[PDB]
């Protein structure tokens, strides 16, 4: 798994509760041989959501 963690905002650090609140989005990349396809066999589709 190729991992990237991007931080958008540091909301607060609550000293009383000792809690850090952050807004992030995780970048996760990996290989799945079962979901392997060629664009040429499907009309040039390079991406599927």
């Amino acid at each position: 798994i190729s991992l990237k963690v991007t931080l958008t905002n540091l909301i607060s650090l609550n000293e009383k509760e000792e809690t850090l609140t952050t807004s992030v989005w995780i970048g996760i990349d990996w290989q799945d041989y079962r979901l392997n396809y060629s664009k040429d066999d499907f009309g040039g589709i390079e991406t599927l959501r």
Partner: antibody
Amino acid sequence: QVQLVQSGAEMKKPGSSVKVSCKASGGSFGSYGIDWVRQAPGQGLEWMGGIMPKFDAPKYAEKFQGRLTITADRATNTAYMELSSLRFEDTAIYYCARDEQPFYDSWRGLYWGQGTLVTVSS
Amino acid sequence: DIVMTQSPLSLPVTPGEPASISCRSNQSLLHTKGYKYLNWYLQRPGQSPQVLIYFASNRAPGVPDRFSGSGSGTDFTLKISRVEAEDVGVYYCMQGLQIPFTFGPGTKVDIKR
């Protein structure tokens, strides 16, 4: 069934401006998927301009740049062209060709209007 | 501009028999994603033009299954499996890759006698 209804025929003189409408019914059309194609008398079809999602702005042929304005209004399901500084050679039947769902970097024109004859004559 | 040419300039046809029209570009119309941006249009006499084939092989919705299209990067063909009397008019090929988009000179079809 989807119908495109264009404005009526227009009699114009040289130097004036003409505005042709193209209103749709029976379907839903958007900001893109509009292309205008004129056919001069006894001549073939000629692309004038259109709006594609790729440019997000109208693109015109070199013959019409500076004279042609193409707009599409999603809210009222209609599109317009405005050709200014009219010449005798601008006499033609002007068609609107539209697709409900636009192709990103090309155009097909599944739905055509009936065409409007604009005659520029002194 | 890309120059589109068609052959024949006139095709006398007979209802009940096959037919074929061809188009050629002076530049390759192949896209980076692997499809050819060549559309075919039919203008019947008195009517507005109608799209028949788009992107060189795909039949448009509502078009009869008789019309078929194919081609390569520079040469394209439109075929009618069985000509009908309603298929008469001027067929135009159009490149949709490079602005300004250009129509061909057109090929006229009429009943043979």
